[PDB]
Amino acid sequence: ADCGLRPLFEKKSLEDKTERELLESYI
Amino acid sequence: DFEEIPGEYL
Amino acid sequence: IVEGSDAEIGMSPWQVMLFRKSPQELLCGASLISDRWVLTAAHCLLYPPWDKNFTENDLLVRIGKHSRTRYERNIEKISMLEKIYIHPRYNWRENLDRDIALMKLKKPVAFSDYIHPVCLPDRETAASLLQAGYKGRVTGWGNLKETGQPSVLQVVNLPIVERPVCKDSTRIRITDNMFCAGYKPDEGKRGDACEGDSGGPFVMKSPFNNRWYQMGIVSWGEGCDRDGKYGFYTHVFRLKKWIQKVIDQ
Ligand SMILES: CO[C@H](COS(=O)(=O)O)C(=O)N[C@@H](C(=O)N1[C@H](C(=O)NCCC2=CCN(C(=N)N)C2)C[C@@H]2C[C@H](O)[C@@H](O)C[C@@H]21)[C@H](Cl)C(C)C
Ligand code: NA
């Protein structure tokens, strides 16, 4: 589907203020 | 203190 | 949400508010998983020890929301429910095992900048992401403190906790249909879901495909944000056969 891609974020290639924290956590 | 929503939604 | 922050606009376009018609009030959170299907905790809809047993006509869903209280004209959409489905083996008697329910909407919601479904994990994404140490994100408009209402949607990122720690943190019998998340007492960082956040999504962002997956649903916990306690979540992948079953109809 088009699931899990946010119009205001992934779709525009903008990052939210804390998603990086989650990526970081994948050691 | 929720603002009233439109009546069309019941 | 306890010890979280205001969400950004559109940060969580799958966030759904279950809204009570009668005293117009927030009941729970929920998530949008297609144009016609919303996911929530069973105990939001059905809890006999307290006489709670909702019918479709009692509730509305509000999708695209940011502000808790205000009607968000031209942004949010409010839908009626066609049908409620509770997991047949939801255990309200004991420990809220399989705390999950689906709501079918009367009409497909129209997607927008503020309204968009979340992904449900496949076995592989689950196996790779659902690991102790790895962080997800929980959102809702529930309590800011255990004993206090936010003006807007709150967000917190939390690490998944090892099963032995989860089990040792609580008197409740924990099952494989649950996982817990939150910082350990000394780790220094805080945060938890709380009453009102119930039924909201615990999501993770895939490093493989950049998509957000819903892995958990806000279920229960001993208080909110206590040291050596953790929030407990319905394990969505473990219950996905049932999810798919219902959607095939
Ligand atoms: C909020 O905590 C109070 C008190 O904790 S206690 O250990 O000191 O009694 C509580 O009732 N928690 C109970 C409870 O969670 N719950 C569930 C609940 O309210 N869920 C809301 C979401 C949430 C609440 C706390 N969370 C969190 N991440 N920290 C998540 C419903 C469940 C059923 C009743 O609606 C009532 O007995 C409260 C129970 C659990 Cl099962 C406890 C008895 C083991
Ligand atoms: Na906690």
Side-chain angles (χ1 to χ4, degrees), chain A residues 1-12 15-19 21-23 25-27, chain C residues 8-11 13-14 112-113 116-119 134-137 157 183 189 205 207 210-212:
Chain A
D2 207 47
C3 64
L5 302 170
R6 306 167 290 180
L8 294 181
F9 297 93
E10 295 74 28
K11 274 151 137 211
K12 290 174 108 94
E15 282 181 9
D16 71 49
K17 296 148 163 153
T18 51
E19 59 177 274
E21 174 178 358
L22 310 172
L23 165 67
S25 78
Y26 309 153
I27 56 197
Chain C
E8 296 174 61
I9 308 293
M11 164 190 266
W14 34 79
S112 67
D113 285 358
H116 201 88
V118 73
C119 305
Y134 289 21
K135 300 179 180 189
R137 179 181 283 174
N157 306 335
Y183 290 102
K189 293 194 195 181
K205 186 183 176 150
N210 267 221
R211 294 182 198 254
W212 285 88

mmCIF file of all heavy atoms in Angstrom, chain A residues 1-12 15-19 21-23 25-27, chain C residues 8-11 13-14 112-113 116-119 134-137 157 183 189 205 207 210-212:
data_model
loop_
_atom_site.group_PDB
_atom_site.id
_atom_site.type_symbol
_atom_site.label_atom_id
_atom_site.label_comp_id
_atom_site.label_asym_id
_atom_site.label_seq_id
_atom_site.Cartn_x
_atom_site.Cartn_y
_atom_site.Cartn_z
ATOM 1 N N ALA A 1 0.846 -1.234 0.000
ATOM 2 C CA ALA A 1 0.000 0.000 0.000
ATOM 3 C C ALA A 1 0.872 1.271 0.000
ATOM 4 O O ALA A 1 2.075 1.235 -0.305
ATOM 5 C CB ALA A 1 -0.944 -0.022 1.227
ATOM 6 N N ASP A 2 0.254 2.400 0.341
ATOM 7 C CA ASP A 2 0.991 3.621 0.618
ATOM 8 C C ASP A 2 1.148 3.833 2.142
ATOM 9 O O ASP A 2 1.359 4.959 2.605
ATOM 10 C CB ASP A 2 0.245 4.789 0.001
ATOM 11 C CG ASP A 2 1.149 5.914 -0.335
ATOM 12 O OD1 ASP A 2 2.211 5.635 -0.946
ATOM 13 O OD2 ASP A 2 0.805 7.071 0.022
ATOM 14 N N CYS A 3 1.044 2.751 2.918
ATOM 15 C CA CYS A 3 0.970 2.883 4.362
ATOM 16 C C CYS A 3 2.277 3.418 4.945
ATOM 17 O O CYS A 3 3.326 3.178 4.381
ATOM 18 C CB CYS A 3 0.597 1.546 5.026
ATOM 19 S SG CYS A 3 1.813 0.205 4.804
ATOM 20 N N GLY A 4 2.182 4.142 6.063
ATOM 21 C CA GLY A 4 3.340 4.446 6.908
ATOM 22 C C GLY A 4 4.224 5.526 6.354
ATOM 23 O O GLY A 4 5.293 5.818 6.921
ATOM 24 N N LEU A 5 3.814 6.111 5.222
ATOM 25 C CA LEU A 5 4.548 7.250 4.650
ATOM 26 C C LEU A 5 3.782 8.511 4.913
ATOM 27 O O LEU A 5 2.724 8.697 4.350
ATOM 28 C CB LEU A 5 4.806 7.082 3.149
ATOM 29 C CG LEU A 5 5.600 5.809 2.835
ATOM 30 C CD1 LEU A 5 5.628 5.548 1.328
ATOM 31 C CD2 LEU A 5 7.020 5.893 3.441
ATOM 32 N N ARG A 6 4.293 9.379 5.776
ATOM 33 C CA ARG A 6 3.509 10.574 6.166
ATOM 34 C C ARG A 6 3.539 11.685 5.086
ATOM 35 O O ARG A 6 4.605 12.057 4.630
ATOM 36 C CB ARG A 6 3.959 11.115 7.527
ATOM 37 C CG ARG A 6 3.949 10.052 8.654
ATOM 38 C CD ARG A 6 4.681 10.561 9.868
ATOM 39 N NE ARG A 6 6.149 10.668 9.673
ATOM 40 C CZ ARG A 6 6.970 11.094 10.628
ATOM 41 N NH1 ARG A 6 6.453 11.453 11.796
ATOM 42 N NH2 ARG A 6 8.301 11.182 10.429
ATOM 43 N N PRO A 7 2.363 12.185 4.650
ATOM 44 C CA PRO A 7 2.384 13.282 3.685
ATOM 45 C C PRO A 7 3.331 14.436 4.101
ATOM 46 O O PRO A 7 4.037 14.993 3.260
ATOM 47 C CB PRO A 7 0.933 13.746 3.670
ATOM 48 C CG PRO A 7 0.191 12.523 3.891
ATOM 49 C CD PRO A 7 0.985 11.802 4.975
ATOM 50 N N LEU A 8 3.380 14.771 5.384
ATOM 51 C CA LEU A 8 4.155 15.941 5.774
ATOM 52 C C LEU A 8 5.605 15.629 6.116
ATOM 53 O O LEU A 8 6.414 16.541 6.403
ATOM 54 C CB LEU A 8 3.445 16.718 6.882
ATOM 55 C CG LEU A 8 2.132 17.348 6.447
ATOM 56 C CD1 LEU A 8 1.488 18.147 7.614
ATOM 57 C CD2 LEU A 8 2.299 18.242 5.182
ATOM 58 N N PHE A 9 5.939 14.338 6.105
ATOM 59 C CA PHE A 9 7.282 13.953 6.433
ATOM 60 C C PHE A 9 7.963 13.115 5.343
ATOM 61 O O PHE A 9 8.556 13.700 4.427
ATOM 62 C CB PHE A 9 7.354 13.386 7.870
ATOM 63 C CG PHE A 9 6.981 14.412 8.910
ATOM 64 C CD1 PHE A 9 5.676 14.517 9.356
ATOM 65 C CD2 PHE A 9 7.930 15.310 9.397
ATOM 66 C CE1 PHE A 9 5.313 15.498 10.308
ATOM 67 C CE2 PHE A 9 7.586 16.288 10.347
ATOM 68 C CZ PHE A 9 6.267 16.374 10.819
ATOM 69 N N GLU A 10 7.861 11.782 5.404
ATOM 70 C CA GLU A 10 8.486 10.939 4.379
ATOM 71 C C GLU A 10 8.152 11.364 2.948
ATOM 72 O O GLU A 10 9.025 11.374 2.084
ATOM 73 C CB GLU A 10 8.157 9.456 4.555
ATOM 74 C CG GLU A 10 8.711 8.827 5.819
ATOM 75 C CD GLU A 10 7.951 9.253 7.092
ATOM 76 O OE1 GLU A 10 6.741 9.567 7.009
ATOM 77 O OE2 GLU A 10 8.563 9.249 8.183
ATOM 78 N N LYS A 11 6.890 11.673 2.681
ATOM 79 C CA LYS A 11 6.482 12.029 1.317
ATOM 80 C C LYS A 11 7.167 13.297 0.781
ATOM 81 O O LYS A 11 7.370 13.429 -0.429
ATOM 82 C CB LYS A 11 4.959 12.114 1.208
ATOM 83 C CG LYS A 11 4.281 10.748 0.909
ATOM 84 C CD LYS A 11 2.851 10.676 1.478
ATOM 85 C CE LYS A 11 1.855 10.029 0.501
ATOM 86 N NZ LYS A 11 0.438 10.594 0.655
ATOM 87 N N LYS A 12 7.521 14.207 1.690
ATOM 88 C CA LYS A 12 8.210 15.463 1.381
ATOM 89 C C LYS A 12 9.697 15.381 1.671
ATOM 90 O O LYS A 12 10.411 16.372 1.479
ATOM 91 C CB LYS A 12 7.704 16.593 2.284
ATOM 92 C CG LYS A 12 6.323 17.071 2.033
ATOM 93 C CD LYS A 12 5.980 18.072 3.126
ATOM 94 C CE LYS A 12 5.942 19.471 2.598
ATOM 95 N NZ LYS A 12 4.509 19.726 2.239
ATOM 96 N N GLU A 15 12.131 15.310 8.094
ATOM 97 C CA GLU A 15 12.225 14.476 9.282
ATOM 98 C C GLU A 15 11.566 15.205 10.421
ATOM 99 O O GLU A 15 11.650 16.439 10.485
ATOM 100 C CB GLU A 15 13.677 14.246 9.652
ATOM 101 C CG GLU A 15 14.386 13.218 8.803
ATOM 102 C CD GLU A 15 15.814 13.033 9.254
ATOM 103 O OE1 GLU A 15 16.174 13.579 10.323
ATOM 104 O OE2 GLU A 15 16.586 12.372 8.540
ATOM 105 N N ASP A 16 10.908 14.456 11.313
ATOM 106 C CA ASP A 16 10.367 15.065 12.515
ATOM 107 C C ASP A 16 11.487 15.183 13.536
ATOM 108 O O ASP A 16 12.546 14.581 13.368
ATOM 109 C CB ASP A 16 9.095 14.356 13.043
ATOM 110 C CG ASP A 16 9.358 12.969 13.653
ATOM 111 O OD1 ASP A 16 10.272 12.837 14.487
ATOM 112 O OD2 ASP A 16 8.614 12.013 13.302
ATOM 113 N N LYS A 17 11.262 15.968 14.578
ATOM 114 C CA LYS A 17 12.303 16.270 15.572
ATOM 115 C C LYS A 17 12.905 15.079 16.319
ATOM 116 O O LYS A 17 14.018 15.193 16.828
ATOM 117 C CB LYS A 17 11.806 17.323 16.572
ATOM 118 C CG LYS A 17 11.512 18.694 15.932
ATOM 119 C CD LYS A 17 10.357 19.394 16.691
ATOM 120 C CE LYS A 17 10.284 20.895 16.391
ATOM 121 N NZ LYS A 17 8.879 21.415 16.549
ATOM 122 N N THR A 18 12.233 13.929 16.375
ATOM 123 C CA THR A 18 12.796 12.847 17.177
ATOM 124 C C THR A 18 12.908 11.464 16.531
ATOM 125 O O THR A 18 13.389 10.521 17.171
ATOM 126 C CB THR A 18 12.095 12.719 18.544
ATOM 127 O OG1 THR A 18 10.684 12.649 18.349
ATOM 128 C CG2 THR A 18 12.389 13.913 19.431
ATOM 129 N N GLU A 19 12.503 11.328 15.274
ATOM 130 C CA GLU A 19 12.545 10.018 14.633
ATOM 131 C C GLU A 19 13.957 9.475 14.582
ATOM 132 O O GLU A 19 14.165 8.266 14.617
ATOM 133 C CB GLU A 19 11.936 10.048 13.238
ATOM 134 C CG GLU A 19 12.587 11.016 12.261
ATOM 135 C CD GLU A 19 11.948 10.916 10.899
ATOM 136 O OE1 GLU A 19 12.377 10.055 10.106
ATOM 137 O OE2 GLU A 19 11.001 11.679 10.646
ATOM 138 N N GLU A 21 16.191 9.512 16.892
ATOM 139 C CA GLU A 21 16.345 8.738 18.128
ATOM 140 C C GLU A 21 15.996 7.250 17.943
ATOM 141 O O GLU A 21 16.689 6.366 18.481
ATOM 142 C CB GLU A 21 15.489 9.385 19.220
ATOM 143 C CG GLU A 21 15.427 8.629 20.548
ATOM 144 C CD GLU A 21 14.608 9.345 21.592
ATOM 145 O OE1 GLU A 21 14.096 10.463 21.306
ATOM 146 O OE2 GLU A 21 14.488 8.790 22.714
ATOM 147 N N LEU A 22 14.951 6.977 17.160
ATOM 148 C CA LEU A 22 14.514 5.607 16.938
ATOM 149 C C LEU A 22 15.495 4.853 16.054
ATOM 150 O O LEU A 22 15.809 3.693 16.322
ATOM 151 C CB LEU A 22 13.090 5.562 16.333
ATOM 152 C CG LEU A 22 11.990 6.395 17.018
ATOM 153 C CD1 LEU A 22 10.726 6.399 16.223
ATOM 154 C CD2 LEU A 22 11.719 5.890 18.391
ATOM 155 N N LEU A 23 15.966 5.519 14.995
ATOM 156 C CA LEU A 23 16.929 4.945 14.054
ATOM 157 C C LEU A 23 18.257 4.594 14.756
ATOM 158 O O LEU A 23 18.878 3.528 14.538
ATOM 159 C CB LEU A 23 17.175 5.960 12.926
ATOM 160 C CG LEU A 23 18.401 5.678 12.054
ATOM 161 C CD1 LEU A 23 18.181 4.398 11.236
ATOM 162 C CD2 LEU A 23 18.765 6.879 11.155
ATOM 163 N N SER A 25 18.554 3.951 17.861
ATOM 164 C CA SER A 25 18.377 2.818 18.768
ATOM 165 C C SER A 25 18.566 1.432 18.134
ATOM 166 O O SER A 25 18.658 0.432 18.846
ATOM 167 C CB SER A 25 17.028 2.898 19.465
ATOM 168 O OG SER A 25 16.016 2.464 18.593
ATOM 169 N N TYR A 26 18.652 1.352 16.815
ATOM 170 C CA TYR A 26 18.905 0.046 16.191
ATOM 171 C C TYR A 26 20.391 -0.290 16.228
ATOM 172 O O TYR A 26 20.937 -0.877 15.295
ATOM 173 C CB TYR A 26 18.328 -0.031 14.777
ATOM 174 C CG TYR A 26 16.881 0.391 14.709
ATOM 175 C CD1 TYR A 26 16.344 0.919 13.537
ATOM 176 C CD2 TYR A 26 16.050 0.272 15.829
ATOM 177 C CE1 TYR A 26 15.017 1.324 13.481
ATOM 178 C CE2 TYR A 26 14.733 0.679 15.794
ATOM 179 C CZ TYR A 26 14.217 1.197 14.609
ATOM 180 O OH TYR A 26 12.906 1.584 14.572
ATOM 181 N N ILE A 27 21.013 0.073 17.354
ATOM 182 C CA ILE A 27 22.466 -0.059 17.621
ATOM 183 C C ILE A 27 23.353 -0.200 16.389
ATOM 184 O O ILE A 27 23.363 0.695 15.535
ATOM 185 C CB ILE A 27 22.794 -1.139 18.719
ATOM 186 C CG1 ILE A 27 22.205 -2.524 18.362
ATOM 187 C CG2 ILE A 27 22.342 -0.627 20.108
ATOM 188 C CD1 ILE A 27 22.115 -3.538 19.537
ATOM 189 N N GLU C 8 4.299 17.183 16.491
ATOM 190 C CA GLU C 8 4.257 18.102 15.353
ATOM 191 C C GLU C 8 2.975 17.868 14.548
ATOM 192 O O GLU C 8 2.369 16.809 14.664
ATOM 193 C CB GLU C 8 5.475 17.903 14.470
ATOM 194 C CG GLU C 8 6.787 18.254 15.181
ATOM 195 C CD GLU C 8 7.982 17.901 14.343
ATOM 196 O OE1 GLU C 8 8.111 18.460 13.238
ATOM 197 O OE2 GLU C 8 8.781 17.052 14.778
ATOM 198 N N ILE C 9 2.556 18.870 13.778
ATOM 199 C CA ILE C 9 1.446 18.731 12.853
ATOM 200 C C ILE C 9 1.732 17.596 11.841
ATOM 201 O O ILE C 9 2.799 17.540 11.233
ATOM 202 C CB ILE C 9 1.166 20.076 12.102
ATOM 203 C CG1 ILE C 9 1.015 21.263 13.085
ATOM 204 C CG2 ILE C 9 -0.031 19.934 11.159
ATOM 205 C CD1 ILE C 9 -0.231 21.206 14.005
ATOM 206 N N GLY C 10 0.767 16.699 11.656
ATOM 207 C CA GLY C 10 0.912 15.576 10.708
ATOM 208 C C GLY C 10 1.905 14.483 11.075
ATOM 209 O O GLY C 10 2.151 13.572 10.273
ATOM 210 N N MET C 11 2.493 14.579 12.268
ATOM 211 C CA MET C 11 3.501 13.650 12.750
ATOM 212 C C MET C 11 2.976 12.219 12.955
ATOM 213 O O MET C 11 3.729 11.236 12.890
ATOM 214 C CB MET C 11 4.095 14.197 14.043
ATOM 215 C CG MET C 11 4.862 13.174 14.842
ATOM 216 S SD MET C 11 5.328 13.720 16.487
ATOM 217 C CE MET C 11 6.979 14.353 16.191
ATOM 218 N N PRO C 13 -0.362 10.773 11.412
ATOM 219 C CA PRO C 13 -1.617 10.934 10.677
ATOM 220 C C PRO C 13 -2.535 9.728 10.793
ATOM 221 O O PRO C 13 -3.621 9.743 10.251
ATOM 222 C CB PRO C 13 -1.153 11.118 9.233
ATOM 223 C CG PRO C 13 0.102 10.398 9.129
ATOM 224 C CD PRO C 13 0.773 10.599 10.487
ATOM 225 N N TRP C 14 -2.096 8.697 11.516
ATOM 226 C CA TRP C 14 -2.888 7.496 11.746
ATOM 227 C C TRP C 14 -3.568 7.553 13.127
ATOM 228 O O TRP C 14 -4.384 6.689 13.451
ATOM 229 C CB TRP C 14 -2.018 6.223 11.615
ATOM 230 C CG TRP C 14 -0.633 6.436 12.078
ATOM 231 C CD1 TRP C 14 -0.184 6.463 13.358
ATOM 232 C CD2 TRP C 14 0.499 6.712 11.245
ATOM 233 N NE1 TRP C 14 1.162 6.753 13.380
ATOM 234 C CE2 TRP C 14 1.609 6.877 12.093
ATOM 235 C CE3 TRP C 14 0.679 6.810 9.857
ATOM 236 C CZ2 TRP C 14 2.883 7.171 11.602
ATOM 237 C CZ3 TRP C 14 1.951 7.094 9.363
ATOM 238 C CH2 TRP C 14 3.034 7.261 10.236
ATOM 239 N N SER C 112 -5.470 12.624 3.582
ATOM 240 C CA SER C 112 -5.036 14.007 3.374
ATOM 241 C C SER C 112 -3.653 14.190 3.996
ATOM 242 O O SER C 112 -3.021 13.209 4.373
ATOM 243 C CB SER C 112 -6.044 14.968 4.006
ATOM 244 O OG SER C 112 -6.021 14.835 5.417
ATOM 245 N N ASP C 113 -3.188 15.430 4.110
ATOM 246 C CA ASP C 113 -1.938 15.726 4.839
ATOM 247 C C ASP C 113 -1.995 15.270 6.310
ATOM 248 O O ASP C 113 -0.963 15.033 6.914
ATOM 249 C CB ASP C 113 -1.626 17.208 4.815
ATOM 250 C CG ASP C 113 -1.089 17.689 3.458
ATOM 251 O OD1 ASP C 113 -0.920 16.873 2.525
ATOM 252 O OD2 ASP C 113 -0.847 18.907 3.336
ATOM 253 N N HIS C 116 -3.756 9.488 7.167
ATOM 254 C CA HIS C 116 -3.011 8.497 6.368
ATOM 255 C C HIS C 116 -2.803 7.232 7.227
ATOM 256 O O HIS C 116 -2.456 7.346 8.391
ATOM 257 C CB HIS C 116 -1.652 9.101 5.959
ATOM 258 C CG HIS C 116 -1.052 8.426 4.780
ATOM 259 N ND1 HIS C 116 -1.332 8.806 3.484
ATOM 260 C CD2 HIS C 116 -0.273 7.321 4.691
ATOM 261 C CE1 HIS C 116 -0.716 7.987 2.647
ATOM 262 N NE2 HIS C 116 -0.068 7.076 3.354
ATOM 263 N N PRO C 117 -3.020 6.022 6.675
ATOM 264 C CA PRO C 117 -2.860 4.812 7.512
ATOM 265 C C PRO C 117 -1.412 4.440 7.867
ATOM 266 O O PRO C 117 -0.504 4.740 7.111
ATOM 267 C CB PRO C 117 -3.412 3.712 6.624
ATOM 268 C CG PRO C 117 -3.125 4.208 5.239
ATOM 269 C CD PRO C 117 -3.414 5.672 5.303
ATOM 270 N N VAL C 118 -1.251 3.729 8.979
ATOM 271 C CA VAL C 118 -0.001 3.131 9.390
ATOM 272 C C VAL C 118 0.112 1.700 8.824
ATOM 273 O O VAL C 118 -0.891 1.084 8.500
ATOM 274 C CB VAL C 118 0.126 3.178 10.971
ATOM 275 C CG1 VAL C 118 -0.798 2.175 11.647
ATOM 276 C CG2 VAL C 118 1.576 2.982 11.436
ATOM 277 N N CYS C 119 1.337 1.185 8.681
ATOM 278 C CA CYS C 119 1.538 -0.205 8.249
ATOM 279 C C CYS C 119 1.420 -1.174 9.401
ATOM 280 O O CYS C 119 1.674 -0.826 10.539
ATOM 281 C CB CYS C 119 2.897 -0.437 7.576
ATOM 282 S SG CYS C 119 3.296 0.619 6.181
ATOM 283 N N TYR C 134 15.717 -1.461 21.303
ATOM 284 C CA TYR C 134 15.132 -0.699 20.173
ATOM 285 C C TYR C 134 13.959 0.154 20.633
ATOM 286 O O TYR C 134 13.108 -0.321 21.395
ATOM 287 C CB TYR C 134 14.666 -1.664 19.083
ATOM 288 C CG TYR C 134 15.772 -2.354 18.303
ATOM 289 C CD1 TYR C 134 17.074 -2.467 18.803
ATOM 290 C CD2 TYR C 134 15.502 -2.924 17.067
ATOM 291 C CE1 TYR C 134 18.076 -3.111 18.075
ATOM 292 C CE2 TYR C 134 16.500 -3.577 16.336
ATOM 293 C CZ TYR C 134 17.782 -3.657 16.850
ATOM 294 O OH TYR C 134 18.742 -4.309 16.102
ATOM 295 N N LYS C 135 13.884 1.398 20.152
ATOM 296 C CA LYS C 135 12.821 2.320 20.580
ATOM 297 C C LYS C 135 11.627 2.459 19.608
ATOM 298 O O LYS C 135 11.785 2.481 18.399
ATOM 299 C CB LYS C 135 13.374 3.725 20.859
ATOM 300 C CG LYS C 135 14.445 3.825 21.935
ATOM 301 C CD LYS C 135 14.875 5.274 22.055
ATOM 302 C CE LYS C 135 15.944 5.446 23.128
ATOM 303 N NZ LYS C 135 16.247 6.884 23.437
ATOM 304 N N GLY C 136 10.433 2.573 20.159
ATOM 305 C CA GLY C 136 9.300 2.981 19.373
ATOM 306 C C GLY C 136 8.728 4.256 19.940
ATOM 307 O O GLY C 136 9.309 4.856 20.836
ATOM 308 N N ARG C 137 7.556 4.637 19.442
ATOM 309 C CA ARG C 137 6.924 5.908 19.760
ATOM 310 C C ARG C 137 5.456 5.672 20.083
ATOM 311 O O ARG C 137 4.810 4.879 19.428
ATOM 312 C CB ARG C 137 7.061 6.821 18.547
ATOM 313 C CG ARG C 137 6.443 8.177 18.699
ATOM 314 C CD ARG C 137 6.618 8.985 17.429
ATOM 315 N NE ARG C 137 7.968 9.530 17.291
ATOM 316 C CZ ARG C 137 8.414 10.175 16.212
ATOM 317 N NH1 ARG C 137 7.635 10.316 15.145
ATOM 318 N NH2 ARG C 137 9.653 10.661 16.190
ATOM 319 N N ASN C 157 9.088 8.670 22.760
ATOM 320 C CA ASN C 157 9.832 7.516 22.293
ATOM 321 C C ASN C 157 10.340 6.658 23.454
ATOM 322 O O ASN C 157 10.917 7.185 24.388
ATOM 323 C CB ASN C 157 11.032 7.971 21.467
ATOM 324 C CG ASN C 157 10.648 8.906 20.342
ATOM 325 O OD1 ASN C 157 9.514 8.887 19.861
ATOM 326 N ND2 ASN C 157 11.613 9.730 19.901
ATOM 327 N N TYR C 183 11.930 3.250 30.066
ATOM 328 C CA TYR C 183 13.292 3.268 30.539
ATOM 329 C C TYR C 183 13.409 2.576 31.895
ATOM 330 O O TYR C 183 12.481 2.633 32.724
ATOM 331 C CB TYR C 183 13.765 4.707 30.632
ATOM 332 C CG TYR C 183 13.951 5.369 29.292
ATOM 333 C CD1 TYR C 183 12.995 6.251 28.790
ATOM 334 C CD2 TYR C 183 15.087 5.112 28.527
ATOM 335 C CE1 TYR C 183 13.167 6.864 27.539
ATOM 336 C CE2 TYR C 183 15.271 5.712 27.286
ATOM 337 C CZ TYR C 183 14.313 6.591 26.806
ATOM 338 O OH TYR C 183 14.513 7.192 25.584
ATOM 339 N N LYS C 189 16.436 8.720 31.524
ATOM 340 C CA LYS C 189 15.294 9.234 30.757
ATOM 341 C C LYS C 189 13.981 8.641 31.285
ATOM 342 O O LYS C 189 13.975 7.535 31.824
ATOM 343 C CB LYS C 189 15.454 8.940 29.263
ATOM 344 C CG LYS C 189 16.599 9.675 28.558
ATOM 345 C CD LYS C 189 16.435 9.558 27.041
ATOM 346 C CE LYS C 189 17.692 9.936 26.268
ATOM 347 N NZ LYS C 189 17.443 9.812 24.785
ATOM 348 N N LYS C 205 9.676 3.046 13.151
ATOM 349 C CA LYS C 205 10.000 3.372 11.743
ATOM 350 C C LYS C 205 11.022 2.410 11.207
ATOM 351 O O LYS C 205 12.099 2.256 11.799
ATOM 352 C CB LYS C 205 10.472 4.803 11.566
ATOM 353 C CG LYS C 205 10.674 5.178 10.117
ATOM 354 C CD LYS C 205 11.231 6.601 10.005
ATOM 355 C CE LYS C 205 11.518 6.927 8.570
ATOM 356 N NZ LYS C 205 11.356 8.378 8.367
ATOM 357 N N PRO C 207 14.011 0.989 9.226
ATOM 358 C CA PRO C 207 15.214 1.479 8.555
ATOM 359 C C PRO C 207 15.390 0.840 7.177
ATOM 360 O O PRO C 207 16.294 1.221 6.429
ATOM 361 C CB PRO C 207 16.331 1.048 9.498
ATOM 362 C CG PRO C 207 15.849 -0.259 10.069
ATOM 363 C CD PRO C 207 14.323 -0.047 10.233
ATOM 364 N N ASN C 210 11.695 2.968 5.194
ATOM 365 C CA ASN C 210 11.219 4.277 5.724
ATOM 366 C C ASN C 210 9.739 4.386 6.133
ATOM 367 O O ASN C 210 9.218 5.498 6.311
ATOM 368 C CB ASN C 210 11.610 5.467 4.814
ATOM 369 C CG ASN C 210 12.927 6.110 5.238
ATOM 370 O OD1 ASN C 210 13.070 7.352 5.233
ATOM 371 N ND2 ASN C 210 13.882 5.271 5.668
ATOM 372 N N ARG C 211 9.070 3.246 6.262
ATOM 373 C CA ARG C 211 7.665 3.235 6.626
ATOM 374 C C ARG C 211 7.470 3.010 8.120
ATOM 375 O O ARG C 211 8.279 2.364 8.805
ATOM 376 C CB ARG C 211 6.940 2.171 5.843
ATOM 377 C CG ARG C 211 6.876 2.449 4.349
ATOM 378 C CD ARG C 211 6.109 1.358 3.677
ATOM 379 N NE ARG C 211 6.330 1.305 2.237
ATOM 380 C CZ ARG C 211 5.460 1.706 1.323
ATOM 381 N NH1 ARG C 211 4.289 2.219 1.693
ATOM 382 N NH2 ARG C 211 5.763 1.597 0.028
ATOM 383 N N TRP C 212 6.363 3.521 8.629
ATOM 384 C CA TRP C 212 6.061 3.404 10.041
ATOM 385 C C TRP C 212 5.164 2.232 10.170
ATOM 386 O O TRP C 212 4.160 2.127 9.426
ATOM 387 C CB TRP C 212 5.362 4.674 10.528
ATOM 388 C CG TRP C 212 6.275 5.821 10.676
ATOM 389 C CD1 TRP C 212 6.616 6.746 9.700
ATOM 390 C CD2 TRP C 212 6.981 6.211 11.862
ATOM 391 N NE1 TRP C 212 7.493 7.676 10.222
ATOM 392 C CE2 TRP C 212 7.724 7.383 11.544
ATOM 393 C CE3 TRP C 212 7.069 5.686 13.161
ATOM 394 C CZ2 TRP C 212 8.549 8.035 12.483
ATOM 395 C CZ3 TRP C 212 7.880 6.357 14.105
ATOM 396 C CH2 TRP C 212 8.624 7.499 13.743
#
